[PDB]
Enzyme design. Structure first.
Site, PDB file in Angstrom:
ATOM      1  N   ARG A   1       0.829  -1.206   0.000  1.00  0.00           N
ATOM      2  CA  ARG A   1       0.000   0.000   0.000  1.00  0.00           C
ATOM      3  C   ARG A   1       0.866   1.259   0.000  1.00  0.00           C
ATOM      4  O   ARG A   1       0.396   2.346  -0.356  1.00  0.00           O
ATOM      5  CB  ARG A   1      -0.912   0.020   1.233  1.00  0.00           C
ATOM      6  CG  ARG A   1      -0.159   0.229   2.544  1.00  0.00           C
ATOM      7  CD  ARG A   1      -1.070   0.372   3.774  1.00  0.00           C
ATOM      8  NE  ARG A   1      -0.250   0.332   4.982  1.00  0.00           N
ATOM      9  CZ  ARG A   1       0.143  -0.792   5.572  1.00  0.00           C
ATOM     10  NH1 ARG A   1      -0.232  -1.963   5.070  1.00  0.00           N
ATOM     11  NH2 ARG A   1       0.951  -0.751   6.622  1.00  0.00           N
TER      12      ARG A   1
ATOM     13  N   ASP B   1       5.828   6.736   0.996  1.00  0.00           N
ATOM     14  CA  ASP B   1       5.447   6.890   2.395  1.00  0.00           C
ATOM     15  C   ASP B   1       6.647   6.912   3.344  1.00  0.00           C
ATOM     16  O   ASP B   1       6.707   6.122   4.292  1.00  0.00           O
ATOM     17  CB  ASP B   1       4.489   5.767   2.807  1.00  0.00           C
ATOM     18  CG  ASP B   1       3.894   5.983   4.191  1.00  0.00           C
ATOM     19  OD1 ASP B   1       3.758   7.152   4.615  1.00  0.00           O
ATOM     20  OD2 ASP B   1       3.559   4.984   4.856  1.00  0.00           O
TER      21      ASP B   1
HETATM   22  C1  LIG Z   1       2.185  11.952  -1.246  1.00  0.00           C
HETATM   23  C2  LIG Z   1       1.252  10.721  -1.277  1.00  0.00           C
HETATM   24  C3  LIG Z   1       0.836  10.566  -2.796  1.00  0.00           C
HETATM   25  C4  LIG Z   1       1.831  10.760  -3.832  1.00  0.00           C
HETATM   26  C5  LIG Z   1       1.517  10.665  -5.217  1.00  0.00           C
HETATM   27  C6  LIG Z   1       0.199  10.373  -5.647  1.00  0.00           C
HETATM   28  N1  LIG Z   1      -0.041  10.307  -6.993  1.00  0.00           N
HETATM   29  C7  LIG Z   1      -1.313  10.025  -7.414  1.00  0.00           C
HETATM   30  C8  LIG Z   1      -2.398   9.792  -6.512  1.00  0.00           C
HETATM   31  C9  LIG Z   1      -2.149   9.863  -5.103  1.00  0.00           C
HETATM   32  C10 LIG Z   1      -0.829  10.160  -4.637  1.00  0.00           C
HETATM   33  C11 LIG Z   1      -0.506  10.259  -3.218  1.00  0.00           C
HETATM   34  C12 LIG Z   1       2.006   9.442  -0.892  1.00  0.00           C
HETATM   35  N2  LIG Z   1       3.279   9.367  -0.649  1.00  0.00           N
HETATM   36  N3  LIG Z   1       3.620   8.150  -0.358  1.00  0.00           N
HETATM   37  C13 LIG Z   1       2.572   7.409  -0.397  1.00  0.00           C
HETATM   38  C14 LIG Z   1       2.435   6.028  -0.154  1.00  0.00           C
HETATM   39  C15 LIG Z   1       1.105   5.521  -0.258  1.00  0.00           C
HETATM   40  C16 LIG Z   1       0.028   6.415  -0.596  1.00  0.00           C
HETATM   41  C17 LIG Z   1      -1.379   5.928  -0.669  1.00  0.00           C
HETATM   42  C18 LIG Z   1      -2.565   6.730  -0.974  1.00  0.00           C
HETATM   43  N4  LIG Z   1      -3.604   5.968  -0.930  1.00  0.00           N
HETATM   44  N5  LIG Z   1      -3.231   4.761  -0.633  1.00  0.00           N
HETATM   45  C19 LIG Z   1      -4.152   3.633  -0.499  1.00  0.00           C
HETATM   46  C20 LIG Z   1      -1.855   4.643  -0.455  1.00  0.00           C
HETATM   47  N6  LIG Z   1       0.245   7.743  -0.836  1.00  0.00           N
HETATM   48  N7  LIG Z   1       1.473   8.184  -0.731  1.00  0.00           N
END
Ligand SMILES: C[C@@H](c1ccc2ncccc2c1)c1nnc2ccc(-c3cnn(C)c3)nn12
Length: 289
Positions: free
Chosen positions: A153, A167
């Site tokens: 995830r 993340d």
């Molecule tokens: C900054 C944010 C992020 C970055 C880029 C995205 N691009 C496109 C769409 C959403 C985005 C979200 C982010 N940074 N590291 C992570 C790791 C996991 C997740 C995540 C969101 N929903 N789920 C189920 C997992 N989000 N996440």
């Protein structure tokens, strides 16, 4: 209002490297593309236009906690690897907490990607995604950086289907609350079903406990994003692991690959492979496909 005099001048000088002027950034607050505990993620665009993901931190309303979160995550700017998510910058402004700007990931997080039934990734696709994570984690370990929350995830896929370990640092949050539990010694929300046994016991995190998590993540890939230990309550996960029990071999996981998982879960942290060693093992396995 975030005052840079309140920010350690030590912090001001690291942040200054990556600051983005508010006129250089457009954010679409009506377009949520992700949800974390510290705030939501929005479609943004950064100036020469760049599509990006804008992470809010507005849930963190205390200046000191904001300052500590920046301090801990800023080293992120110093990393560069094709399998590690990069920081585009930080946008300080007129009211509210700083916005963190990251590259846009066209295919979202890895778990949702492989659970998608039209995608129907093959065994070879999945093993390949796992190899990519191993390489990004190889890089981070070389930097002595412990992730503490590696899971499917928490990895993202860009427009070229390159996997980014994500993340961590300024992008750190809990993006799916179902898998974080207070039933552990700290009393705070933790991903207990991805945690190495010694982490649950001593509360410490190392690169070797990341190795453990990587094993669970491999398991997730081969099950196409099934939840680990669906039958073990968060109350029982520690003793379950003490009794020697582990996640079972996925129906479509090659015997060689299951061996790698078991190794990542060895009770003796020093007995588990390095990520450099995992990149070798898994590459040879992929190649024999
Ligand atoms: C900054 C944010 C992020 C970055 C880029 C995205 N691009 C496109 C769409 C959403 C985005 C979200 C982010 N940074 N590291 C992570 C790791 C996991 C997740 C995540 C969101 N929903 N789920 C189920 C997992 N989000 N996440």
């Amino acid at each position: 209002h975030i005052d840079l005099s309140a920010l350690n001048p030590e912090l001001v000088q690291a942040v200054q490297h990556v600051v983005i002027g508010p006129s250089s950034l457009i954010v679409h607050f009506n377009e949520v593309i992700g949800r974390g505990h510290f705030g939501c993620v929005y479609h943004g665009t950064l100036l020469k236009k760049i599509h990006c993901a804008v992470k809010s931190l507005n849930r963190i309303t205390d200046i000191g906690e904001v300052s500590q979160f920046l301090t801990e995550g800023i080293i992120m700017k110093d990393f560069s690897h094709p399998n590690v998510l990069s920081l585009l910058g930080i946008c300080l402004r007129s009211e509210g907490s700083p916005l963190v700007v990251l590259p846009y990931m066209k295919h979202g997080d890895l778990r949702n990607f492989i659970r998608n039934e039209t995608h129907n990734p093959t065994v070879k696709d999945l093993i390949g995604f796992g190899l990519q994570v191993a390489k990004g984690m190889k890089y981070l370990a070389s930097k002595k950086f412990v992730h503490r929350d590696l899971a499917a995830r928490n990895c993202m896929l860009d427009e070229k289907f390159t996997v980014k370990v994500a993340d961590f640092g300024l992008a750190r949050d809990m993006y799916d609350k179902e898998y974080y539990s207070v039933h552990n010694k700290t009393g705070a929300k933790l991903p207990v079903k991805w945690m190495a046994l010694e982490s649950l016991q001593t509360q410490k995190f190392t690169t070797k406990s990341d190795v453990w998590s990587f094993g669970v993540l491999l398991w997730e890939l081969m099950t196409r994003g099934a939840p680990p230990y669906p039958d073990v309550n968060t109350f029982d996960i520690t003793v379950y692991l003490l009794q020697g029990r582990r996640l079972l071999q996925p129906e479509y996981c090659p015997d060689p690959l299951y061996e790698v998982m078991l190794k990542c879960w060895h009770p003796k942290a020093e007995m588990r492979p390095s990520f450099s060693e995992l990149v070798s093992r898994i590459s040879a396995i992929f190649s024999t496909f």
